[PDB]
Amino acid sequence: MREIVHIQGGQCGNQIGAKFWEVISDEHGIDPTGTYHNVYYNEATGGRYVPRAILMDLEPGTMDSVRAGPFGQLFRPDNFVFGQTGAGNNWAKGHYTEGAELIDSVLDVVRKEAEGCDCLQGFQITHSLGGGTGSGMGTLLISKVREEYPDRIMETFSVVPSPKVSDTVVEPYNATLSVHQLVENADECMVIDNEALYDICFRTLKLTTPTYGDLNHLVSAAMSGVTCCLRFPGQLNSDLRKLAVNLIPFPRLHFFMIGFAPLTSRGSQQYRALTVPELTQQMFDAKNMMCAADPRHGRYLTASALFRGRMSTKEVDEQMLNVQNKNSSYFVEWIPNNIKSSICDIPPKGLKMAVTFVGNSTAIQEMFKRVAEQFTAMFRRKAFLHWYTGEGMDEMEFTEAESNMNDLVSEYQQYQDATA
Amino acid sequence: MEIEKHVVDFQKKIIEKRSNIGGKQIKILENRLDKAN
Numbered sequence A: 001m002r003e004i005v006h007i008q009g010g011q012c013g014n015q016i017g018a019k020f021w022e023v024i025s026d027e028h029g030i031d032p033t034g035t036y037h038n039v040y041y042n043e044a045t046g047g048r049y050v051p052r053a054i055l056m057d058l059e060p061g062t063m064d065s066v067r068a069g070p071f072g073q074l075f076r077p078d079n080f081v082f083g084q085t086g087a088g089n090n091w092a093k094g095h096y097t098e099g100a101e102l103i104d105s106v107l108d109v110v111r112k113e114a115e116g117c118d119c120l121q122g123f124q125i126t127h128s129l130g131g132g133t134g135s136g137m138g139t140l141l142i143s144k145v146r147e148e149y150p151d152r153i154m155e156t157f158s159v160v161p162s163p164k165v166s167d168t169v170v171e172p173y174n175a176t177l178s179v180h181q182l183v184e185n186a187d188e189c190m191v192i193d194n195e196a197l198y199d200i201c202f203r204t205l206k207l208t209t210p211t212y213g214d215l216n217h218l219v220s221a222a223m224s225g226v227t228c229c230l231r232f233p234g235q236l237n238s239d240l241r242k243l244a245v246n247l248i249p250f251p252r253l254h255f256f257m258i259g260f261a262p263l264t265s266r267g268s269q270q271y272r273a274l275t276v277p278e279l280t281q282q283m284f285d286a287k288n289m290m291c292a293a294d295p296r297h298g299r300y301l302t303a304s305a306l307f308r309g310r311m312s313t314k315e316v317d318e319q320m321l322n323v324q325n326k327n328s329s330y331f332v333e334w335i336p337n338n339i340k341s342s343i344c345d346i347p348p349k350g351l352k353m354a355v356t357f358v359g360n361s362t363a364i365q366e367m368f369k370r371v372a373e374q375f376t377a378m379f380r381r382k383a384f385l386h387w388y389t390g391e392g393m394d395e396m397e398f399t400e401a402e403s404n405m406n407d408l409v410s411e412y413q414q415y416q417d418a419t420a
Numbered sequence B: 001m002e003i004e005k006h007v008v009d010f011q012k013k014i015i016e017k018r019s020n021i022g023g024k025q026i027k028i029l030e031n032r033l034d035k036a037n
């Protein structure tokens, strides 16, 4: 049981959710038709399994496109929360004028899906920080669900403004506005960025003609591997809360980087062996992360690992022992045995092993600082402001968002080196 | 002729007043009430 509800947001979040449901259907043996050929699905007369997946957005072209592609019959025709105007890359648009009139349609449907279960252990949001809709609308949904349900655990698979270029000109504004309302009411922010995702699909995988469905498939395989330890048996099982405890020692430093494995070349997929020491090499390799922040330029406040496949436990023991042994000061030493380990008992579709590494570390603080830097630049010199200020927002909130980001990062950095 | 130019003055006055005057939410507020109740 121990339910999940899959609310989406923005065209990004919509595509990622579509492909994630594709992956979970293809894993649980669910067709695009919705049969078997409940921890994620719901029973429906006629022998159907409907995903309790809500797609909300301020534009329907995304809605139409996600309906059009394969696996579209999964989502039932009520959870398509239709927006007609579009926030148009404006946090004020996506959070105040259209938020405060979409909140409650979403409230009725989320109460729908929440009473549909018995025990809703955790939520599920995938959205953006830069798009007006995604950012504002999504952090507003987060605030609302965290207002009524204080006992659940919040979780966002969040895409941030890209380093080399900003996807939309107001990426800094929307991103700081999203994190300022993310810190207190979002319990686990898995930080992803389109550019690092590009890097991981490019470097070791031969992919020369990539596509957004491809990156969605990658991050959705990761998104399935993070929790696949829940719905399946295992010698040493976990959940969202053992993970949350072993990951956050403080309610603030709870933003996590994620990676999934294995991922190698296909033409070279035969020449290499395939073992668990090789899995450790694969992801404790710096380049295998899904965030534009090499974690070995910082420190690991703690890190959790979740296996998939049936091998021994001698493995995971020597695993985190060996890795702590050499990359010790790459972690933080003020906390004992900072690596947590669990095992899911089932391997992936067609392959032998899977591994998911999640990390509560202090290298995303530079991501936060680069966001705040771009923000402050466009902010003092007043770049792209009337779009936010002529729609019932003031820059007092912008100042406080920027300063709050800076406060978060100041704790991140001092906790990097705090020792006793 | 005095009367026609006088109504010309009239017309001028009226076009000036038209240019001067040239210078819905209740239901959506009920919708705003529905949620809180």
Ligand SMILES: Nc1nc2c(ncn2[C@@H]2O[C@H](COP(=O)(O)OP(=O)(O)O)[C@@H](O)[C@H]2O)c(=O)[nH]1
Residues within 6 Å of the ligand: A009, A010, A011, A012, A013, A015, A016, A087, A088, A089, A090, A094, A128, A129, A130, A131, A132, A133, A134, A135, A159, A167, A168, A194, A212, A213, A215, A216
């Ligand atoms: N991973 C991924 N990211 C996307 C995709 N489409 C858009 N994005 C990112 O999402 C951001 C757009 O945010 P969004 O909220 O959807 O825009 P909005 O709907 O106009 O407010 C951009 O910065 C893109 O980089 C996708 O298919 N996959």
